[PDB]
Amino acid sequence: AKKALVNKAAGKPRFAVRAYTRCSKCGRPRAVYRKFGLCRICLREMAHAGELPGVQKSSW
Amino acid sequence: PRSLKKGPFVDEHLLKKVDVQNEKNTKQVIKTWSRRSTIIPDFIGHTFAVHDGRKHVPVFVTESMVGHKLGEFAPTRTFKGHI
Amino acid sequence: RPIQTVGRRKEAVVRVRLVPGTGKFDLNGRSLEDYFPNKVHQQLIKAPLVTVDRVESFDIFAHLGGGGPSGQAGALRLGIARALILVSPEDRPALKKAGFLTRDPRATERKKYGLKKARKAPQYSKR
Amino acid sequence: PRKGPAPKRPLVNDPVYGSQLVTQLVNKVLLKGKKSLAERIVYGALEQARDKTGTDPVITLKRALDNVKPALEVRSRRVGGATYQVPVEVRPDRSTTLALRWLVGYSRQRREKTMIERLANEILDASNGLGASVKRREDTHKMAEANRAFAH
Amino acid sequence: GQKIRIRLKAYDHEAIDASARKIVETVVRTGASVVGPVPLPTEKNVYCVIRSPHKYKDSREHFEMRTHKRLIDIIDPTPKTVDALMRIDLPASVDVNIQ
Amino acid sequence: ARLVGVDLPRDKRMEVALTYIFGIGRTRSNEILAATGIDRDLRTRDLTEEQLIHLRDYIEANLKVEGDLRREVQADIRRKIEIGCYQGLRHRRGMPVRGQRTKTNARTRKGPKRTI
RNA sequence: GGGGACUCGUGAGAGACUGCCGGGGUCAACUCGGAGGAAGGUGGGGAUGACGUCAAGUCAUCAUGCCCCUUAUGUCCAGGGCUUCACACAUGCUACAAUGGCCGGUACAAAGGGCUGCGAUGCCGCGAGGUUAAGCGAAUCCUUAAAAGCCGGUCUCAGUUCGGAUCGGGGUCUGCAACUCGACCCCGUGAAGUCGGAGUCGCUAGUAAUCGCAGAUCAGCAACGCUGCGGUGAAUACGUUCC
Ligand SMILES: [Mg+2]
Ligand SMILES: [Mg+2]
Ligand SMILES: [Mg+2]
Ligand SMILES: [Mg+2]
Ligand SMILES: [Mg+2]
Ligand SMILES: [Mg+2]
Ligand SMILES: [Mg+2]
Ligand SMILES: [Mg+2]
Ligand SMILES: [Mg+2]
Ligand SMILES: [Mg+2]
Ligand SMILES: [Mg+2]
Ligand SMILES: [Mg+2]
Ligand SMILES: [Mg+2]
Ligand SMILES: [Mg+2]
Ligand SMILES: [Mg+2]
Ligand SMILES: [Mg+2]
Ligand SMILES: [Mg+2]
Ligand SMILES: [Zn+2]
Secondary structure, eight states: OOHHHHHHHHSOOSSGGGOOOOOSSSOOSSSOOTTTOOOHHHHHHHHHHTOSTTEEEOOO | OOSTTSOOOOOHHHHHHHTTTTTTOOOSSOEEOOTTOBOOTTOTTOEEEEEOSSSEEEEEOOSSTTSSBGGGGSOSSOOOOOO | OOBOOEEESSSOEEEBOBOSSSOOOBSSSOOHHHHOOOHHHHHHTTHHHHSSSOOSOSOOBBOOOSSOHHHHHHHHHHHHHHHHHHHOSTTHHHHHHHTOSOOOOOOOOOOOTTSSSSSOOOOOOOO | OOSOOOOOOOOOOOSSSOSHHHHHHHHHHOOTTOHHHHHHHHHHHHHHHHHHHOSOHHHHHHHHHHHTOOOEEOOEEEOSSOEEEOOEEOOHHHHHHHHHHHHHHHHHTSSSSSHHHHHHHHHHHHHHTOSHHHHHHHHHHHHHHTTTTOOO | OOOOOBOOEESSTTTHHHHHHTTGGGHHHHTOOOOOOOOOOOEEEEEEEESSSSSOTTOEEEEEEEEEEOOOOOOOOOHHHHHHHHHSOOOTTEEOOBO | OOSSSOOOOTTOBHHHHGGGSTTOOHHHHHHHHHHHOOOSSOBGGGOOHHHHHHHHHHHHHHSOOTTHHHHHHHHHHHHHHHHTOHHHHHHHHTOOSSSOOOSSOOTTTSOSOOOO
């Protein structure tokens, strides 16, 4: 989103409940999986590129 | 804060302004910006121009608005009857 | 050497321990009436034993796990059928034609994205 | 469908009453997956009918279904500027299914309290040939016979 | 006695069994009581993502994260074999855990 | 018979008849019956004036009845109206007060669809 | 303890590929039926989306050519709002009851989650919840009680022992802060609604139908959304003229 908001999130916040989790690749504040820390779209692209140990396509 | 384990929720920077005046007098119109502070039974006789987004609404407690909140009396939205 | 086979219907597996006996379904402390109040289940179980011959003979006992009432009943039926087949290979045509030997593979259809259930879809509502 | 017929799934015989008929009625009255509840309702109705009559419930049911078995249907068709009904013959299985559905539907919306006595009264009325299912069968038969001219 | 335990876990297939039975199972000559690798159920982590970057909710792709655990043997804490085990190291794709 | 209201629906368990009073429902009737001792499953026609007169004092001892409860309710809402809070303004406009959405709902507080 | 007897778990194979036979078919394709079998013609399902179209969507996942501001169209903070409300639409839930409601007892799952946590028991409280505390990086601990199912009593077709929207009072949890602007618990009050017009939606087998379980986002807000899991569990297809 905005790099200013990225820096504001990354910094130590007063009233710590004001903090939030964003994507580690693009900074998307939504659809961030705490297991990886990336957003949904970035996670899908990373999975397709196969740079996640253990993450691959599922069929069942 | 709506729990019988910590008392009410009153802002410290509000107490240090109301308790330093109620000793001698009921102060005149006052500026406040924290609508979320509870009314302790020390605001009787005083006035509070509580912010509502665009301006400050002066609110006077007589006897009953002790369990209420400062922003309870400040319309945050305005509706005026489409028809 | 006790006779033990594998029997499943939907999700339940029963480990038969068929031995010679008089015949009374031991299902871990609960009798046939105690466990299964359904006449359909009480016939489905003991169907393989009375399908040909004979006629209310040696009992079985199998552990219980998974599924529901009908699934457990079917698993027990298949287990008794396979145990009878193993004990006596002569009546193999009987149960084989009766269809008590088939596993009957039938599992719940997995839910698919975009549909409110496995096959039920949301309302179309064109335009 | 277009690619030929589809075989119909088989049924089992009830240990209490060794006939596919009773299982058919249980299947027809079954709703929300409560096969045990449908069996309970049908058994209560059958026991009530036996209490009121004395003869065998399966025999009473057979008399009822023979009385309420229809002959022709009134399936409609459209050709040009008007639509008219075409009376055609009915197979025994389809006739039995239609009669059972009619009996169950008319027992569902009767003026009694529970489906035990409701279905007992319905099956008794069908056995005596004077019930709602019998009336519906007569209406269908006569209204189809009134369209005998268009029998193509 | 039966003190030393292994909690080998790998995120990939065909490497866990090899790096167990050809590295840890080298202590059969060293003289450690081996029970053999015990195949525990595979873990399965299920996550769902939307294929499109915008507004197409019905396009979803699913992924599975499998983790395989085995080799929970109770091999004896003989000094020679335990020193050999701590000196040898397995590839990072499999995680070793000495209990 | 009448204590405050009719309290006597014909052929009804008094457990549910007590719910017909303004101040007692299922749980209040159950706790009252638990305290008193009289069984729940009994037809109201079989109840006797002695049981009525032991029941009459219990309700007024701690609970409350028709009239004064609604007087307290109306006094509360009227005070809320005159003090002029957000909830009081919502009550004055007839709109629901507990933060419920007003775009497509609140048909109970308002009337049915006006269709102007 | 003892055991690999058994499931089971997870590594490797066999098997189901018209394999074999009968009739037919240009003898070929293939069609129809049989024995053995877990399954018969693709055993069932998932992933798998051709040339291209809609100047389809995304300049707000990200990135990018041209223009636009640089005491501002950059940035921060404190409140408000993104949640309004004469109305209409779309998607889900609830009912309108006796296949039922309540009271007591009672049996059977899968798949998941867990050191900013799962809180086994014990105590307080009708209750949600609070307290001290063991085990648990987990097939050994928690979740964990499954609900539908079964039994005995009550209610007796009633706007009801159906219905839980609204309202008053009283508490709990997270959050510095819950009127806007959260969830849950207790009492009382207890609306419409009695099967829904023309019209319209989904569904062929473990399908529809019904009842519960788990995850992800998150301090709290998801037992009405999403994604998966399991139990019980049907009726119809004669036929392709007709939309
Ligand atoms: Mg957060
Ligand atoms: Mg299901
Ligand atoms: Mg649409
Ligand atoms: Mg292909
Ligand atoms: Mg365009
Ligand atoms: Mg666009
Ligand atoms: Mg961009
Ligand atoms: Mg919005
Ligand atoms: Mg919804
Ligand atoms: Mg109720
Ligand atoms: Mg109960
Ligand atoms: Mg307690
Ligand atoms: Mg009625
Ligand atoms: Mg009405
Ligand atoms: Mg109600
Ligand atoms: Mg209609
Ligand atoms: Mg959550
Ligand atoms: Zn991203």
